[PDB]
PDB file of all heavy atoms in Angstrom:
ATOM      1  N   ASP B  28     -89.677  51.294  38.833  1.00 73.69           N
ATOM      2  CA  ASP B  28     -89.672  50.448  39.955  1.00 73.69           C
ATOM      3  C   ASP B  28     -89.613  49.006  39.505  1.00 73.69           C
ATOM      4  O   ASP B  28     -90.359  48.649  38.618  1.00 73.69           O
ATOM      5  CB  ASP B  28     -90.828  50.711  40.882  1.00 73.69           C
ATOM      6  CG  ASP B  28     -90.592  50.077  42.310  1.00 73.69           C
ATOM      7  OD1 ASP B  28     -89.911  49.011  42.360  1.00 73.69           O
ATOM      8  OD2 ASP B  28     -91.252  50.504  43.240  1.00 73.69           O
ATOM      9  N   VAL B  29     -88.798  48.207  39.971  1.00 70.18           N
ATOM     10  CA  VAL B  29     -88.630  46.860  39.510  1.00 70.18           C
ATOM     11  C   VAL B  29     -88.649  45.797  40.745  1.00 70.18           C
ATOM     12  O   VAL B  29     -88.286  44.663  40.642  1.00 70.18           O
ATOM     13  CB  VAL B  29     -87.308  46.603  38.741  1.00 70.18           C
ATOM     14  CG1 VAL B  29     -87.344  47.493  37.486  1.00 70.18           C
ATOM     15  CG2 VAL B  29     -86.122  46.866  39.578  1.00 70.18           C
ATOM     16  N   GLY B  30     -89.219  46.329  41.847  1.00 68.24           N
ATOM     17  CA  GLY B  30     -89.305  45.406  42.904  1.00 68.24           C
ATOM     18  C   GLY B  30     -87.855  45.212  43.523  1.00 68.24           C
ATOM     19  O   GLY B  30     -86.927  45.943  43.293  1.00 68.24           O
ATOM     20  N   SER B  33     -85.319  41.148  40.978  1.00 63.89           N
ATOM     21  CA  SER B  33     -85.192  41.064  39.486  1.00 63.89           C
ATOM     22  C   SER B  33     -83.703  41.450  39.111  1.00 63.89           C
ATOM     23  O   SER B  33     -83.185  40.682  38.418  1.00 63.89           O
ATOM     24  CB  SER B  33     -86.115  42.016  38.887  1.00 63.89           C
ATOM     25  OG  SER B  33     -87.356  41.296  38.637  1.00 63.89           O
ATOM     26  N   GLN B  91     -81.507  44.297  33.872  1.00 55.88           N
ATOM     27  CA  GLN B  91     -82.938  44.062  34.257  1.00 55.88           C
ATOM     28  C   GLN B  91     -83.747  43.639  32.977  1.00 55.88           C
ATOM     29  O   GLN B  91     -83.725  44.406  32.037  1.00 55.88           O
ATOM     30  CB  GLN B  91     -83.639  45.130  34.974  1.00 55.88           C
ATOM     31  CG  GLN B  91     -84.670  44.741  35.951  1.00 55.88           C
ATOM     32  CD  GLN B  91     -85.966  44.505  35.291  1.00 55.88           C
ATOM     33  OE1 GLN B  91     -86.698  43.486  35.733  1.00 55.88           O
ATOM     34  NE2 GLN B  91     -86.388  45.333  34.414  1.00 55.88           N
ATOM     35  N   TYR B  92     -84.309  42.497  32.908  1.00 57.09           N
ATOM     36  CA  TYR B  92     -84.986  41.939  31.690  1.00 57.09           C
ATOM     37  C   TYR B  92     -83.978  41.806  30.670  1.00 57.09           C
ATOM     38  O   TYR B  92     -82.807  41.345  31.016  1.00 57.09           O
ATOM     39  CB  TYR B  92     -86.169  42.804  31.408  1.00 57.09           C
ATOM     40  CG  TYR B  92     -87.404  42.700  32.297  1.00 57.09           C
ATOM     41  CD1 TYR B  92     -88.241  43.760  32.394  1.00 57.09           C
ATOM     42  CD2 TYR B  92     -87.710  41.453  32.914  1.00 57.09           C
ATOM     43  CE1 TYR B  92     -89.379  43.673  33.169  1.00 57.09           C
ATOM     44  CE2 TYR B  92     -88.837  41.342  33.618  1.00 57.09           C
ATOM     45  CZ  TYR B  92     -89.677  42.516  33.793  1.00 57.09           C
ATOM     46  OH  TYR B  92     -90.741  42.310  34.595  1.00 57.09           O
TER      47      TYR B  92
ATOM     48  N   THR C 119    -103.432  36.752  39.107  1.00 29.37           N
ATOM     49  CA  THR C 119    -102.704  36.582  40.243  1.00 29.37           C
ATOM     50  C   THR C 119    -103.129  37.522  41.386  1.00 29.37           C
ATOM     51  O   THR C 119    -103.622  38.537  41.198  1.00 29.37           O
ATOM     52  CB  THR C 119    -101.097  36.821  40.110  1.00 29.37           C
ATOM     53  OG1 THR C 119    -100.833  38.164  39.948  1.00 29.37           O
ATOM     54  CG2 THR C 119    -100.588  36.017  38.952  1.00 29.37           C
ATOM     55  N   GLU C 158     -98.101  36.383  33.504  1.00 32.38           N
ATOM     56  CA  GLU C 158     -97.418  36.208  34.691  1.00 32.38           C
ATOM     57  C   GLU C 158     -96.624  37.490  35.159  1.00 32.38           C
ATOM     58  O   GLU C 158     -96.575  37.946  36.295  1.00 32.38           O
ATOM     59  CB  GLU C 158     -96.508  34.913  34.709  1.00 32.38           C
ATOM     60  CG  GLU C 158     -95.855  34.641  36.092  1.00 32.38           C
ATOM     61  CD  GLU C 158     -95.117  33.240  35.952  1.00 32.38           C
ATOM     62  OE1 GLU C 158     -94.994  32.630  34.977  1.00 32.38           O
ATOM     63  OE2 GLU C 158     -94.678  32.810  37.130  1.00 32.38           O
ATOM     64  N   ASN C 159     -96.061  38.089  34.073  1.00 35.25           N
ATOM     65  CA  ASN C 159     -95.597  39.462  34.261  1.00 35.25           C
ATOM     66  C   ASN C 159     -95.485  40.143  32.840  1.00 35.25           C
ATOM     67  O   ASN C 159     -94.847  39.672  31.848  1.00 35.25           O
ATOM     68  CB  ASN C 159     -94.107  39.457  34.703  1.00 35.25           C
ATOM     69  CG  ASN C 159     -93.677  40.784  35.339  1.00 35.25           C
ATOM     70  OD1 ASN C 159     -93.370  41.755  34.607  1.00 35.25           O
ATOM     71  ND2 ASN C 159     -93.786  40.859  36.708  1.00 35.25           N
ATOM     72  N   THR C 161     -94.581  42.876  31.538  1.00 34.24           N
ATOM     73  CA  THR C 161     -93.348  43.595  31.090  1.00 34.24           C
ATOM     74  C   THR C 161     -92.192  42.693  30.783  1.00 34.24           C
ATOM     75  O   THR C 161     -91.132  43.075  30.523  1.00 34.24           O
ATOM     76  CB  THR C 161     -92.989  44.723  32.038  1.00 34.24           C
ATOM     77  OG1 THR C 161     -93.300  44.303  33.448  1.00 34.24           O
ATOM     78  CG2 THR C 161     -93.740  45.988  31.813  1.00 34.24           C
TER      79      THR C 161
HETATM   80  C1  NAG D   1     -93.526  42.136  37.415  1.00 23.76           C
HETATM   81  O1  NAG D   1     -92.138  42.504  37.107  1.00 23.76           O
HETATM   82  C2  NAG D   1     -91.923  43.859  37.756  1.00 23.76           C
HETATM   83  C3  NAG D   1     -90.444  44.166  37.362  1.00 23.76           C
HETATM   84  O2  NAG D   1     -89.611  42.953  37.388  1.00 23.76           O
HETATM   85  C4  NAG D   1     -92.054  43.780  39.286  1.00 23.76           C
HETATM   86  O3  NAG D   1     -91.848  45.010  39.781  1.00 23.76           O
HETATM   87  C5  NAG D   1     -93.562  43.218  39.705  1.00 23.76           C
HETATM   88  O4  NAG D   1     -93.599  43.080  41.049  1.00 23.76           O
HETATM   89  C6  NAG D   1     -93.732  41.842  38.861  1.00 23.76           C
HETATM   90  N1  NAG D   1     -95.083  41.407  39.137  1.00 23.76           N
HETATM   91  C7  NAG D   1     -95.349  40.219  39.621  1.00 23.76           C
HETATM   92  C8  NAG D   1     -96.801  39.805  39.840  1.00 23.76           C
HETATM   93  O5  NAG D   1     -94.520  39.435  39.695  1.00 23.76           O
END
Side-chain angles (χ1 to χ4, degrees):
Chain B
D28 195 336
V29 297
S33 268
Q91 213 274 140
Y92 285 153
Chain C
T119 73
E158 192 170 6
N159 203 278
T161 37

